[PDB]
Structures are given as structure tokens and as C-alpha cells.
Design a protein around this ligand. Structure first.
Ligand SMILES: [Au+]
Ligand SMILES: [Au+]
Ligand SMILES: [Au+]
Lengths: 64, 62
């Protein structure tokens, strides 16, 4: 609950790296992993699909 | 903006300090400060009013 819900209704998958100004990993309880991006063309905030290949490589270039 | 929303739809102003098991400030762009609490016996996760005096009394110790 009523008061609390996950900030991402769904994940968007047609967002290109060149379009995103910032990326943030939301740490909200009882919610799956959530990456939030600040945009261009619109400039809004979107929840991006973590399975995006470019997000994967980006998150993977954080070590092994 | 069709996908992202603030995780708190409203704040709960009647919760007592005795009832809260855990508190967590949420990192959340384009939203006001938001505090999530886990309730003691039923374990529900609720958004609680930052304006609550005991919440202040805690954040003012920082
Ligand atoms: Au962001
Ligand atoms: Au438009
Ligand atoms: Au919590």
C-alpha cells in the first residue's frame, strides 16, 4: 504494501548507451535488481533491462 | 517515467518506534527523501514519514 512498492514497473530494453546520462543501482528491499538511467531525447528517468548486452559489458568491465 | 516511479506512494504517520525492526533510507532520483521500515511481528515493509519526531531525533544525531 500500500505505501511501499518497487520503483520499476517494468524494464525498458530499447535504450542505447549513447542515450544515457547516468546509471544507478537502486537498493530497494524485496525488489529484484534495478538499474535506473537518466536519459537524453526525453531527459526522463527509466528502468533499463539489465539483460541489455551493453549494460552487461558495462557491468562486466567492473572486474572478474 | 512510464517505468520508473517513487517507491513510496504515501508516508505512514502513525508508526511507533517500538514497532520498527529496521530502517533504510532509499537512494532514489527525482523523489523526496524516503525511509523504508520493516515492521516487527508481521515483517511488512512500509514507507514512514521522515517528519516523525523520533525519525528526526535519530537523523539529528548525525
Ligand atoms: Au540516474
Ligand atoms: Au512527447
Ligand atoms: Au528496511
Amino acid at each position: 504494501s500500500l505505501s511501499y512498492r518497487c520503483p520499476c514497473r517494468f524494464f525498458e530494453s530499447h535504450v542505447a548507451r549513447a542515450n544515457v546520462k547516468h546509471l544507478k543501482i537502486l537498493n530497494t528491499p524485496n525488489c529484484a535488481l534495478q538499474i535506473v538511467a537518466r536519459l537524453k531525447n526525453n531527459n526522463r528517468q527509466v528502468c533499463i533491462d539489465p539483460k541489455l548486452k551493453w549494460i552487461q559489458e558495462y557491468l562486466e568491465k567492473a572486474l572478474n
